[PDB]
Each structure stands twice: as C-alpha cells, then as structure tokens.
Paper text:
Meiosis arrest female 1 (MARF1) is a cytoplasmic RNA binding protein that is essential for meiotic progression of mouse oocytes, in part by limiting retrotransposon expression. Thus, MARF1 post-transcriptionally represses gene expression by serving as both an endoribonuclease and as a platform that recruits the DCP1:DCP2 decapping complex to targeted mRNAs.
The MARF1 NYN domain consists of a central six-stranded parallel beta-sheet flanked by pairs of alpha-helices on both sides, in contrast to the previously determined structure of the NYN domain of Bacillus subtilis YacP/Rae1, whose central beta-sheet contains only five strand. A prominent feature of the molecular surface of the MARF1 NYN domain is a highly conserved negatively charged patch formed by Asp358, Asp426, Asp427 and Asp452. Similar clusters of acidic amino acids define the active sites of PIN domain ribonucleases, including SMG6 and MCPIP1, in which they coordinate a divalent metal ion that in turn coordinates the substrate RNA and activates a water molecule for nucleophilic attack on the scissile phosphodiester group. Importantly, these amino acids are strictly conserved in MARF1 orthologs and map to equivalent residues in the SMG6 and MCPIP1 domain structures. Crucially these residues are not present in the SMG5 PIN domain, which has been shown to lack RNase activity. Together, these structural observations strongly suggest that the MARF1 NYN domain is a catalytically competent ribonuclease. In order to determine whether residues in the active site pocket are important for NYN enzymatic activity, we generated a NYN mutant in which Asp426 and 427 were mutated in tandem to alanines (NYNMUT).
Residue numbers in the entry: 349 to 476, 480 to 502
C-alpha cells in the first residue's frame, strides 16, 4: 500500500551472465516486485575491480547503488549486505518489503530478525532450507537472467 521496498543484491553470487544486459536484469526485478511500493534502496555489493566495467556502468545508469568493498576479505561483501539490510530496517517500519538476491544461507538469521522483530515481508531471490524457511516468498534467480538481451 505504498510501503517501502529495498533490494539487496549479492551480485558476486547472483551474477549477470557474460555478454548480457544488466539493465534488463534490473528492469525485470523492478517489474516483478515494485508495483505499489516506494523504492527505498536498490543496491549491490561487489569489488568493482573484479566486475565487468560495462555492467557497472549499466548499474549506475539504472540507479542501482554499487557499494564497493575489497573482496580480498572473503566476508566483506556478506558483512556489507548484512549491514545494509539492518540499516534499511533501522528507519523503516512495517509494512515494508525486503528483497534479498543471494543464495548465501549465511543470511538466515538476518531474515529471521527482519521477519519477526521488524515484521517485514521477505522475498528471497535465490539459486537453491534454513535460508528459505524465514522468507515469505521464494523466487528463483534464474527467471531474472534467462534469455537476456545481449550487448
């Protein structure tokens, strides 16, 4: 009902296929999820020195925040995703929707907090049960990267 939505994208693990339009992936996510909502956040975490520069430019043209971390710390991206989920939850109240685009079961408890103590609607976009259990909705990441337009 005009409730806020935040998208948090683990793009290291749910990546855009080589040669394909990241713009189209972002468009598909927004088309699937954003009707009736106000966008509070749409962010991905990555080490931009590892990522395809054209993909990153597409993301910035699509107004997806590209939060840079140094991936030589193996838990840096996961930590930043957790912190961003929590920051979203810190100043919004139910009703609100979190879309986590990740397959990292490491987020289980985060989602539990968001579901139980914050009362948020949780959509997990994953590649595939402990992680799935706390989500309200489970969507396969594949539908957002299948048969994409090519560069």
């Amino acid at each position: 009902l005009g409730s806020p939505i935040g998208v948090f994208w683990d793009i290291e693990n749910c990546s855009v296929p080589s040669g394909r339009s990241a713009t189209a992936v972002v468009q598909r996510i927004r088309e699937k999820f954003f009707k009736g909502h106000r966008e509070a956040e749409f962010m991905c975490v990555c080490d931009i020195s590892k990522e395809n520069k054209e993909v990153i430019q597409e993301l910035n043209n699509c107004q997806v925040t590209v939060a840079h971390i140094n991936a030589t710390a193996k838990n840096a991206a996961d930590d930043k995703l957790r912190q961003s989920l929590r920051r979203f939850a810190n100043t919004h109240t139910a009703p609100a929707t979190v879309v986590l685009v990740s397959t990292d079961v490491n987020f289980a408890m985060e989602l539990s907090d968001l579901r139980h103590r914050h009362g948020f609607h949780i959509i997990l976009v994953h590649k595939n049960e402990a992680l799935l259990h706390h989500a309200n909705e489970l969507i396969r990441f594949e539908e957002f990267i299948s048969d994409l337009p090519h560069h």
